[PDB]
Every structure is written in C-alpha cells, then in structure tokens.
C-alpha cells in the first residue's frame, strides 16, 4: 500500500497541512498506537499531536478505542482518506437529485466533517444569500425540508452517539466514552420549531445538541453502482431497456444489502405500476424485454422465481465482473493496440490456450502475436499455468498454457491508478510552486484593484496595473491555467476507474 500512503500524504497536506499529515501517515503506516508513542516516534510536541488527532477524528479519518489498562489507541481508516478525492463528485450528484440547497448541505457536512442539524440549516441559509438578490431572504424552513428528504433517501446519516452516562455506568469518568451505533435512529431527525433568516455579511439552549450528522458515503456508492449498470444496458440494448433496469434498481434501494449477490426479486406485475406514465408500453411487451435480457450471456438479470407471474432479479456481483473486465480490456486496447486487445479477449474466453492456437484463432501471424503475448506477461495482464510432465519442472518438457486471471489483474491495475493520481498531483504542485513568483506578482497588481475598491477610489488607478512588466509575462499564466485545468480534470476522471475496479474487489472478498 505504498502507493496508497504516498497518495494519502498529499491529500492530508493539501486539505490539512504539514503537522497533521505527519500524524495521519504514521497511523496509516504503523497501525494502532497509544498517544504517548505517536509523539515520540515523530518528534512532534504533545500539544501539536492533540491538535492533529482532534482534527483527524472530527473528519472521521481516525477511530479510537479503549484497551487493556484504559489506554486510548487511535487507528487510521485508510480508505476513508482516499475518499476525500471523490468529494466534488458527491457535491455534483446531490445537485442532480436535489436543488441547490441540497448541494450546500452535503458541502458543509463534508468540509466540517460533523455538524448538528441546527448548525447545518444555519450555515446553508447564510451561504445561499449570495445566490439571490432584491430583499429575498433564505429561510430555515425550505432548508430543513430538503434535509429531511435527504435523510429518508439515506444520503445523510447520524454519527455514532455518546452513551447515556446516567443510565449506563454512573461514576468515575472513563478515558474515552466507548461510542456505539444505534440502528433505530440513524435516519430519525429531531423536530425543530425555530426558524430564521440568513445574514447577508453586513459585518456592521440548543435542542438537537449532540445529534451530529455526516454524509453516508456508502449510499453514494450504491448510486454510482446503479449508473454503471444502467449505462452499460443503455449501450448494449436500448434506452427503453435501460429504464427497465433503472426501475428495478430504484425499487431495490431501500430493501437490499449494499453487499449481496442478489437483490430482492420483483414481479413484472409490480414493475408495471412503478415505471413512469410516459412510457407507452403494454404489459405484454414489458415481458418481451425481460426475457430478452435474461437470454443474454452477460446475465445482468436472472429469473430466480415463478410466483406472481414473471419474477426477475438483477445480478449485482455479475454486473461488476463484467464492468471490471470491460475496464481491464479497455486499458489493454489503448496501451498495446486493437490486435493485442483481440488476444486478450481470445485467451479470456478460451480459458487456457497455447501459442499455436492463439495465432490460429485470432488470424494474427507469428512474430507479431508472440511479441504481444510476451509483453502481457511482463505487465502482469496474463499468466502461465505450466503443467509439468515430470518433477523436474524443466522448460523442455512442459506445456505453457496461458491464462488470464481477472482478480489479480484488477488488483494490479488498481495499484497503477493510485500512483497515477499521485503523479498528476505532483506535476500540478510542482508547476504551482515554481510559479509563486508570478502568482504573487499577478496577485499584487490585482490587490491594488481589490483593496480600496470603492471608498475614495479614484479612476486614476485603472491603467497603472498593466503598466508593470507583467504584461508580456501573462502568456505564461495562460499556460499555467491550461495545465492545471487538465491535471485537475484527469484527477477526477481516474476516480471513475478506481470505483469500478475497487467495487469488484470489494464484493469478491467475504472477510470471514
């Protein structure tokens, strides 16, 4: 996980800074530790360690537990540090299902880590004043009305609660309060009678106290899982067929585990009422689609029943294995070319195969196929079986059956992704640091315009800005921005590859 820890070091430095990435990386690298040795292993002063640990626990990046003799041990949650990279995708997807108020709720929850329901409805109201004009306030009612809709859809969830000291173990205060999760009240909101207005930055006792709320990142992954399945069906069959899949998955949301091979079956009789009214399809034609999907060897859907008419289930695990393979084949095609991608799909279907059959089946000649085969070994896309004749294992007397293993090649390809993003960040930060000369110079000229903008501001200052020697220099700053905007955008787009590969790896593990 040296690629993960390198990437976690950059993320904590960009969002929290130097004297806390030291403590964060040390916890990821060593595992759980008592507080006294976190300082000693690092050379940080004890006050700075407390400051570093308290911010990492606020944003849910470290856990803590009590152990033998009452010592607190902290433990970093490595995967939750990497999910700081997907934050703009979360803020965009809430803007798709919900209005701009629901966008600003999730933004405050992700940036402050935990908020009380009273605090969030305040800060969303304050920030939405800038989006509006001409006297109209934001009011706290239409904030909460989206929050309670977010809650029912499980995008937002309550944090683990402090226990009631009076009911349980009254007496000497514990070193740490040993928090626990309650399954009843995760999605049960407090009722708030207080209302008000957001302050427009003029610049001239609490009922839900302790009811902290945080973003439920696992609910977003159930959303992004659906979009990967729905879009694959949109390509292969039709948009109409894609909607049938979208209908099944939207119903499945509330009543199935986020990790299970099969969802709850639904009858076609109850799919019919759930599909939107504009789809001018008869019930009989709806059953034509469902059988033609179930006939597909990709097996995104299956039967799994016969009661109440036609019964159909959508396959969650088997869709991911298709998508991980489609991700794996697409990188082969771009790196080595279409004729090599031919050989990758050939060996994957003819599960074990030898060189003379590869050239026969793909119609690719010798000295072109073999060069492609031997590269795919050296980049770990493909494997050798090596069935022996004798316990010598001598090369002259064994048959080298090729094989493609999808799970190992997915773990290998994921490791390339974490280093790829870290490189992209390293390029951006290098070009940002080496241009701090020009960035300060272009700030100070704009600072003359920003400072003393209106009070006493005469017109005799608007020409003296381009009068500095920075006017030829400007060509570099257009090159800076076009570089950064491409590096930032690629840092978003590689996350699409991580989520597809990691969700496949997440589901094959039973963690028994």
């Amino acid at each position: 996980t040296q690629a993960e820890i390198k990437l976690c070091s950059l993320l904590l430095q960009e969002h929290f800074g130097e004297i806390v990435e030291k403590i964060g990386v040390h916890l990821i690298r060593t595992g759980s530790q008592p507080l006294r040795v976190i300082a000693h292993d690092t050379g940080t002063s004890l006050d700075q360690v407390k400051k570093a640990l308290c911010v990492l626990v606020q944003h849910n990046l470290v856990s803590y537990q009590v152990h033998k003799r009452g010592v607190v041990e902290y433990e970093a949650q490595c995967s939750r540090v990497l999910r700081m990279l997907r934050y703009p995708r979360y803020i965009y997807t809430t803007k798709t299902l919900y209005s701009d108020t629901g966008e600003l709720i999730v933004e405050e929850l992700l940036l402050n880590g935990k908020l009380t329901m009273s605090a969030v409805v305040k800060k969303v109201a304050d920030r939405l004043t800038e989006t509006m004009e001409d006297g109209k306030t934001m009011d706290y009612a239409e904030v909460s009305n989206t929050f309670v809709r977010l809650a029912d859809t499980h995008f937002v969830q309550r944090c683990p609660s402090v226990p009631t000291t009076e009911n349980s173990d009254p007496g000497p205060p514990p070193p740490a309060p040993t928090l626990v999760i309650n399954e009843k009240d995760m999605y049960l909101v407090p009722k708030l009678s207080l209302i008000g207005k957001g302050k427009r930055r003029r610049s001239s006792p609490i009922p839900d106290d302790g009811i902290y709320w945080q973003a439920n990142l696992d609910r977003f992954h159930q959303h992004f899982r659906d979009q990967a399945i729905v879009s694959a069906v949109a390509n292969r069959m039709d948009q109409t067929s894609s909607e049938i899949v979208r209908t099944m998955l939207r119903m499945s949301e509330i009543t199935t585990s986020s990790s299970a091979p099969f969802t709850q079956p639904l009858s076609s009789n109850e799919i019919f009422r759930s599909l939107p009214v504009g789809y001018n399809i008869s019930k009989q034609v709806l059953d034509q689609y469902l059988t033609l999907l179930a006939d597909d060897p990709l097996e995104f859907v299956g039967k799994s029943g016969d009661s109440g008419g036609g019964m159909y289930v959508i396959n969650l695990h088997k869709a991911l294995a298709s998508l991980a393979t489609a991700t794996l084949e697409s990188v082969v095609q771009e790196r080595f070319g279409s004729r090599c991608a031919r050989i990758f799909r050939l060996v994957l279907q003819k599960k074990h195969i030898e060189q003379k059959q590869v050239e026969d089946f793909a119609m690719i000649p010798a000295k072109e196929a073999k060069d492609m085969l031997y590269k795919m070994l050296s980049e770990n896309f493909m494997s050798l079986q090596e069935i022996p004749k004798t316990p010598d294992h001598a090369p002259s007397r064994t048959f080298y059956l090729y094989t493609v293993n999808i799970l190992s090649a997915a773990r290998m390809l994921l490791h390339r992704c974490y280093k790829s993003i870290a490189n992209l960040i390293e390029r951006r930060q290098f070009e940002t640091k080496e241009n701090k000369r020009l960035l300060e110079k272009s700030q100070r000229v704009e600072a003359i315009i920003a400072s003393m903008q209106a009070t006493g501001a005469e017109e005799a200052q608007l020409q003296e800005i381009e009068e500095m020697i920075t006017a030829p220099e400007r060509q570099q700053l257009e090159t800076l921005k076009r570089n950064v905007n491409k590096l930032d955008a690629s840092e978003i787009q590689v996350d699409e590859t991580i989520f597809l590969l990691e969700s496949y790896i997440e589901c094959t593990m039973k963690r028994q």
């Binding site: 969002h15 929290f16 130097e18 006050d47 640990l53 626990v57 703009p88 940036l111 740490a176 080595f336």
Partner: protein
Amino acid sequence: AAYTFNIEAVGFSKGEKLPDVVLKPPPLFPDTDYKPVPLKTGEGEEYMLALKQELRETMKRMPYFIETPEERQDIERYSKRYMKVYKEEWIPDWRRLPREMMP
C-alpha cells in the same frame, strides 16, 4: 570467445546471427506509438472541475488547516500589534473526544 555455459543449450544451432552489441544506452523516455484518449467535456464534467478548485481555496482558510508555528523572531517592535495574524479558533465537543486530549 566461448563463455562458461554452452551456447547450444540456449540456442544458436546454426552458428550465426548472434544479437548485436548495444553502443549507446536507450533513451530515458522512449517514443511510444500510442497516445492518451482525450478528456471528457460537458456542462456537468466541467462543474466538477470548478468545485474541485474551490475546495482547496476554502479548506486552507478553514480553521482545521493547522499551520506550523513560527519561532525565533529576532526582536520585539511596535509593528507587532499591526501585524498580528488574527484568526478565530474552533472548539471540539469534549464529550466524544477522550479526556487525554484537552489542551
């Protein structure tokens, strides 16, 4: 000249066409035949591009970004009150946090 191993065990039964001798080492960045796929554009994929840059500029200003403390300032002067870096402080909820972490 012959080596320690027998060359016939590796191959080369004809007796010629041995591979050549590399004179200069290959370049550090060799030329590649294939190029990256161009990026995805759109009205939605560019809004994520602008939200990503607004999270850096905000979270450096938010009170969670603990900057490193300065030291070894040389002398005191009357320009200390005029140049005091003022910033409000966040306070946690000490019920959830352990007793061992009070400042």
